[PDB]
């Protein structure tokens, strides 16, 4: 009789399920080795308009283990472990949530504000530890935490068109200079198809460090960083050897899209080498007049002045203390009239080679903050000869510089290449 | 009666493998 | 549940039930193959637009698929594959099922929900008066042996109508597909600004063979920063790559930059066989391949 019910075309519905991950924590097993089904990580998806997410199959064990909120759900004297298929998993398995993407306007936050920082840190820890690939879905993950999200070993991350990471710097201890995301020790990893932005002109998008080790052959593909203070930041030697950027974008950041500086003045020499850019674009970086006058309003109703000084200038890309750098294809452009000293600035490098990169639309200033127009052009050439400024590409103390023949237009500064 | 057992939150365990 | 049509006819007792669908079509066992396109479905009480893949609707209810890892297969929408024909001139595959409308529904789901579309080996056949359109950012991933075969018999202008149209596909990827027609007619893939710019689209291991033009671009500002990686255009009647932003007497315009990496154009142009050939359609009409007896071509035109 009951077998007749089970054998009906909808008989699978007569099998029970656990409704949520907390309910799974509270589900006491009778015997180690049981199998159960978890419908979704959170319950109440049906009252909303959307489908269950983060569910799967779990197996019980008698003993003790450390809870994760993803992989392992622990109770008193027992725990449950996920069955992972194809060596891969999703961020929802850890309780992360997405929402609708805001527009890129200045102080605009998404509609729902759930902080994903601690759960995404747990998911990164699982992906580095077990060597599973992490799959992210479309929508925005919101982040508002005093801690930086860290990647501390080799990892595969694969997003979707429309995957967005939104960072709110309200809770950071130093909002202007704290990093959103720190990468270290990630040899042979890949990170693909992610769009990070902040809408604040504050913070570092992605900071590279040697706190764990070198990022020896990390490959970044379709990674976009927008409206931070710096998009990609490197500030110490020997930490991006043989890194690779493929089709990446840094756009509308306050000072620079790409900022690499192995060492400052009066410090021991050091470098990273080689460095490879393929079809990457920096565009629209630098202080615009709106940005110079803007003030950021935090979630705590505090006001942070965006400018450092009324004479702020920037550039699209800044390279210092590197060696064997190739910039292939791509583009560097000042769309939006930001105040730039140059499109690219190169200092103290060895063999910087540019193959056919598209350079255009610079609104020139000197390092002081003086506008470079036709009327004063002669004066500039007399008084700012030794300045690191005044060209679309400025080259200073570089061995083996080389540029082939790209198309260049709309250069409203003194020269196209400056050598010094 | 057996349907009540199968409909419990850990009912999937009662399927053999 | 035995098939997708049976699922449409299955009335739920309560919203939120879970059921198993073995396969999209029944009768795989009488043939020599395994079920494909099945999955798990959850019921809702209400109304929704039937989709043929994601959503199966009846009167007053519907069923929705559970999608895992943000990805799905074209078989989930009722597409079928068959054995690949050889590249000879007028040769069609053995079974002729037209996949155009179901593959259009699959593309629409991948652009709308931002799921990755996974294609399997074999040929999908296409014989429709409509062009297959991609209208937004998308991930498509085929297998070695994935083939899209196009029959231009039903097109209104077989010589110049496009098989596939791409527009607005910023940040998308499309990999591992082989499109061919065996006809010397039509455009393989046509790029337009009908929706927007294809701002950082990446094509990898995309092969286009035996059309009139393989990759075609005919207007400004629609392939800015596009990328071709390991692509091939082979044995097309006039050119493998034809990019023409503007004609004589028209307003100036361009797209920029454009990047080709390890791409090959080979064998494009009118051969003497092609010059004499006549295409026979499935309606028994004859289409002269040549335009003039003095036709010439080239591999790539920029």
**DSSP assignment of A203-268:** SEEEEE--SS---TT-EEEEEEEESSSEEEEE-SSSSSTTEEEES-EEES-SSEEEEEES--TTS-
Provide the number of CB pairs (under 8 Å) joining chain A to chain C: 72
Cα distances (Å, whole numbers) of residue A386 to A320, A374, A376, A382:
18, 20, 17, 9
How crowded is residue C261: how many other Cβ atoms within 10 Å of its Cβ? 14
Q: How far apart are CA C223 and CA C259, in angstroms?
A: 10
At residue C261's C-alpha, the angle toward residues C111 and C188, to 5°, is 50
A123: three-class secondary structure by DSSP: helix
How crowded is residue C91: how many other Cβ atoms within 10 Å of its Cβ? 9
Q: Are A343 and A313 in contact (CB under 8 A)?
A: no
What one-character DSSP code corresponds to residue C15?
Answer: T
Give pairs for A288-293: CB < 8 Å, separation 24+: A288/A336, A288/A337, A288/A338, A288/A339, A289/A337, A290/A106, A291/A201, A291/A254, A291/A338
Q: How far apart are CA A332 and CA A327, in angstroms?
A: 11
Q: Residues near C170 by Cβ (< 8 Å), separated by ≥ 6? A: A161, C137, C196, C197, C198, C199, C200, C201
Q: How many CA atoms lie within 13 Å of A277's alpha carbon, on the beta-carbon side?
A: 27
How crowded is residue C17: how many other Cβ atoms within 10 Å of its Cβ? 17
Phi, psi dihedral angles at C208 (to 5 degrees): -130, 120
How far, rounded to the nearest angstrom, does the alpha carbon of residue A405 sit from its chain's CA centroid? 32
Q: What tokens does A333 get?
A: 């452009």
Nearest to B9 among A2, A5, A18 (CB): A18
Q: How far apart are CA A197 and CA A249, in angstroms?
A: 11
Q: How far apart are CA A297 and CA A303, in angstroms?
A: 5
Q: What tokens does C281 get?
A: 């359609």
Q: How far apart are CA A400 and CA A377, in angstroms?
A: 30
Q: How far apart are CA A21 and CA A55, in angstroms?
A: 8
How crowded is residue B6: how many other Cβ atoms within 10 Å of its Cβ? 17
Nearest to A135 among C16, C69, C256 (CB): C69
Q: What tokens does A380 get?
A: 């500039």
Strand partners of residue C147: C123, C178
How crowded is residue A265: how many other Cβ atoms within 10 Å of its Cβ? 4
Resolution (A): 2.3
* Torsion angle defined by CA atoms of residues A196, A105, A98 and A100, in that order, rounded to the nearest 10 degrees: -140
Which residue bears the tokens 């009167």?
C59
Q: Are C132 and C149 in contact (CB under 8 A)?
A: no
- Which chain A residue lies closest to B11 (C-alpha atoms)? A16
Q: Are A357 and A346 in contact (CB under 8 A)?
A: no
At residue C255's C-alpha, the angle toward residues C254 and C260, to 5°, is 130
Beta strand residue intervals within A4-76, DSSP E: 35-38, 56-62, 72-75
Q: How far apart are CA A150 and CA C186, in angstroms?
A: 51
Which residue bears the tokens 């960072």?
A167
Give the closest residue to B9 by CA, choosing from C21, C19, A30, A81.
A30
Give the closest residue to A334 by CA, choosing from A412, A227, A414, A226.
A412
Q: Which residues of A touch C114 (CB under 8 A)?
A: 137-138, 160-162
A311: three-class secondary structure by DSSP: coil
Percent of chain B that is helix, strand, coil (3-state, to 5): 55, 0, 45
Q: Are C237 and C211 in contact (CB under 8 A)?
A: yes
Provide the number of CB pairs (under 8 Å) joining chain A to chain B: 40
Which residue bears the tokens 């809408």?
A199
What one-character DSSP code corresponds to residue A18?
Answer: B
Q: Is beta strand C132-134 parallel, antiparallel or unpaired with respect to C122-126?
A: unpaired
Give the closest residue to A253 by CA, choosing from A195, A203, A298.
A203
Q: Are C238 and C262 in contact (CB under 8 A)?
A: no
* Torsion angle defined by CA atoms of residues A408, A414, A416 and A417, in that order, rounded to the nearest 10 degrees: -160
Which residue bears the tokens 């079809």?
A279
CB-based burial of residue A281 (10 Å sphere; 0-12 exposed, 13-18 middle, 19+ buried)? buried
Nearest to B6 among A14, A19, A57 (CB): A14
Q: How far is C72 from chain A (nearest CA, A)?
A: 13
Q: How far apart are CA C113 and CA C101, in angstroms?
A: 18
CB-based burial of residue A93 (10 Å sphere; 0-12 exposed, 13-18 middle, 19+ buried)? buried
Q: What tokens does A340 get?
A: 């730039």
Q: Are A225 and A258 in contact (CB under 8 A)?
A: no
Which residue bears the tokens 């690499």?
A260
User: In chain B, what's the furthest Cα-to-Cα distance?
Assistant: 23
Which residue bears the tokens 């009066």?
A266
Q: How far apart are CA C173 and CA C157, in angstroms?
A: 30
How crowded is residue C39: how many other Cβ atoms within 10 Å of its Cβ? 18
Q: How far apart are CA C212 and CA C268, in angstroms?
A: 9
Give the closest residue to C226 by CA, choosing from C253, C198, C263, C254.
C198
Give pairs for C9-13: CB < 8 Å, separation 24+: C9/C58, C10/A9, C10/A10, C10/C58, C10/C63, C11/C58, C11/C61, C12/A10, C12/C43, C12/C45, C12/C61, C12/C63
Q: Is beta strand C300-301 parallel, antiparallel or unpaired with respect to C239-243?
A: parallel
Beta strand residue intervals within A67-153, DSSP E: 72-75, 78-82, 88-90, 133-135, 139-143, 149-151
Nearest to C259 among A162, A249, A329 (CB): A329
Q: How far apart are CA A152 and CA A126, in angstroms?
A: 11
Strand partners of residue C39: C21
| Alpha helices for A294-414 (secondary structure H) | 377-383
Strand partners of residue A266: none
Q: Which residues of C touch A10 (CB under 8 A)?
A: 1, 10, 12, 17, 19
User: What residues of B are in the A interface, CB distance below 8 Å?
Assistant: 2-3, 6-13, 15, 17
Sheet-wide strand order for C239-243:
C132-134, C162-166, C187-191, C213-217, C239-243, C300-301
Handedness of CA A141, A315, C172, C246 (dihedral sign): positive
CB-based burial of residue A324 (10 Å sphere; 0-12 exposed, 13-18 middle, 19+ buried)? middle
Please report, for chain B, how many H helices and E strands are present, in that order.
Answer: 1, 0
What experiment produced this structure? Answer: cryo-EM
Q: How far is B8 from chain A (nearest CA, A)?
A: 5
Question: Are the beta carbons of A13 and C15 separated by less than 8 Å?
Answer: no
Q: What tokens does A48 get?
A: 């909303």
Q: Are C193 and C218 in contact (CB under 8 A)?
A: no
Q: Residues near A3 by Cβ (< 8 Å), separated by ≥ 6? A: none
Give the closest residue to B10 by CA, choosing from A301, A31, A230.
A31
Q: Is the pair A, C in contact (3+ CB pairs within 8 Å)?
A: yes
Q: Are C9 and C58 in contact (CB under 8 A)?
A: yes
Q: Are C155 and C118 in contact (CB under 8 A)?
A: no
Phi, psi dihedral angles at C135 (to 5 degrees): -125, 25
Q: How far apart are CA C168 and CA C133, in angstroms?
A: 11
- Is it true that the peptide bond before A90 is cis, omega within 30 degrees of 0? no
Question: Are the beta carbons of A19 and B9 separated by less than 8 Å?
Answer: yes
Q: How far apart are CA A336 and CA A166, in angstroms?
A: 23
How crowded is residue A293: how many other Cβ atoms within 10 Å of its Cβ? 11
Q: Are A231 and A198 in contact (CB under 8 A)?
A: no
Q: What tokens does A355 get?
A: 């193959």
Q: Is beta strand A190-197 parallel, antiparallel or unpaired with respect to A156-158?
A: parallel
What one-character DSSP code corresponds to residue A310?
Answer: T
Q: Residues near C169 by Cβ (< 8 Å), separated by ≥ 6? A: C134, C136, C137, C138, C198, C201
């Amino acid at each position: 009789s009951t077998l007749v019910v089970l054998a009906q075309p909808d008989g699978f519905d007569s099998i029970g399920r656990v409704s949520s991950f907390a309910a799974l924590r509270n589900l006491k097993p009778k015997k180690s080795g049981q199998h159960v089904l978890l419908t979704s990580y959170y319950d109440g998806w049906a009252a909303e308009n959307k489908m269950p997410t983060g569910g799967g199959e779990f197996i019980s064990s008698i003993g003790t283990a450390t809870d994760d909120g993803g992989y392992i759900a622990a109770g008193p004297g027992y725990y449950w472990t996920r069955v992972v298929n194809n060596n891969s998993f999703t961020a929802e398995d850890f309780g992360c949530k997405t929402t609708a993407t805001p527009p890129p306007n200045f102080n605009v936050l998404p509609a729902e504000l759930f902080d994903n920082t601690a759960r995404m840190q747990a998911a990164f820890n699982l992906a580095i530890s077990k060597s599973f690939k992490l799959n992210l879905s479309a929508g925005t993950y919101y982040f508002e935490s005093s801690d930086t999200l860290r990647i501390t070993g080799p990892i595969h991350i694969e997003g979707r068109p429309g995957t967005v990471f939104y960072h709110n710097p309200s809770n950071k201890a130093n909002p202007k200079t704290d990093a959103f995301m720190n990468i270290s020790g990630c040899s042979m990893g890949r990170i693909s198809s992610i769009n990070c932005f902040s809408n604040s002109y504050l913070g570092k998008g992605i900071n590279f460090d040697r706190s764990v080790g070198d990022n020896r052959k990390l490959v970044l593909e379709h990674v976009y960083v927008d409206t931070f203070r710096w998009g990609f930041y490197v500030g110490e030697p020997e930490c991006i050897n043989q890194i690779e950027f493929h089709s990446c974008r840094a756009q509308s950041n306050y000072f620079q899209g790409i900022f690499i500086e192995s060492f400052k003045e009066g410090q021991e020499y050091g470098h990273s080498a080689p460095v490879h850019f393929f079809n990457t674009i920096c565009n629209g970086n630098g202080p615009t007049s709106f940005a110079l006058g803007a003030t950021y309003k935090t979630t705590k109703n505090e006001y942070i002045k965006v400018m450092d000084s009324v004479n702020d200038v920037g550039c699209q890309a800044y390279f210092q203390g590197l060696s064997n750098v190739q910039y292939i294809g791509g583009q560097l452009s000042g769309h939006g009239s930001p105040r730039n000293t140059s499109l690219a600035t190169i200092t103290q490098c060895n063999s910087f080679i540019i193959y056919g990169t598209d350079l255009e639309d610079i609104n020139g200033f000197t390092t002081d903050g003086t506008a470079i127009t036709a009327d004063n052009i002669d004066t500039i050439e007399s008084n700012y000869l030794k300045d690191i400024s005044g060209a679309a590409i400025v080259v200073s103390s570089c061995l083996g510089f080389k540029i082939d023949s790209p198309h260049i237009f709309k250069i409203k500064t003194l020269s196209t290449i400056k050598l010094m």
